[PDB]
Each structure stands twice: as structure tokens, then as C-alpha cells.
Structure 1
Amino acid sequence: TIPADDIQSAIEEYVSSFEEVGTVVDAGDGIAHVEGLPSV
């Protein structure tokens, strides 16, 4: 059975449901790799 209610508010119900430091994961010879920092 398929829902045709088109009541996708559920998505909004999660849209409504929802400082930056990264971490060095490897380093050497003047190069580093940094996990995290999503908005660099």
C-alpha cells in the first residue's frame, strides 16, 4: 500500500528536529591531515 497523503511534514518534522575543531590524523615532513572542520 502506498501513501498519497502528500503530508511530507514528517521531513519538516525532522527539519524542525535539528566552535569547529578538527583533529590531526597524520603528520610528517611539514604536512598534516585534519579530520573534521566541515566549513574550512
Structure 2
Amino acid sequence: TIPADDIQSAIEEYVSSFEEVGTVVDAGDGIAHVEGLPSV
């Protein structure tokens, strides 16, 4: 007795529920690491 519905379009019920600025985490000597910016 398991949820064998196989209606994974229920994932759709959630997917449908869904300017980029990052932040310097460390810097020095001319190098900088930037957290964020998922689409660079």
C-alpha cells in the first residue's frame, strides 16, 4: 500500500510556484572571490 499514483505532475504544482548581485567574500593582492551571481 504505497503512493503508486505516479502523478509526478504534482512536481508541476510546485515548479509553477517559481538584478543578480553578488557579494565579495574575500579580496587581496588583486584577486577577489564573489559569492552569488548564479548566471555569470
Instruction: Bin the TM-score by the shorter chain.
Output: 0.7 to 0.9
* Structure 1 unaligned residues grouped into runs of 5+: none
* Structure 2 unaligned residues grouped into runs of 5+: none
Q: Over residues 13-36 of structure 1, what are the superposed CA-to-partner deviations in whole Å (9 max), with x where a residue is unaligned?
A: 001111000000000000000000
1:8 Cα deviation from its structure 2 partner: 1.6
Separation in 2, partners of 1:22, 1:5 = 42
1:9 Cα deviation from its structure 2 partner: 2.2
Identical pairs, percent: 100
1:2 Cα deviation from its structure 2 partner: 1.1
Kindly tell me the number of residue pairs found equivalent between the two proteins: 40
- Structure 1's consecutive aligned runs of 4 or more residues displaced over 4 angstroms after TM superposition are none
2:39 is equivalent to residue 16 of structure 1: no
- Which deviates more, 8-17 or 27-36? 8-17
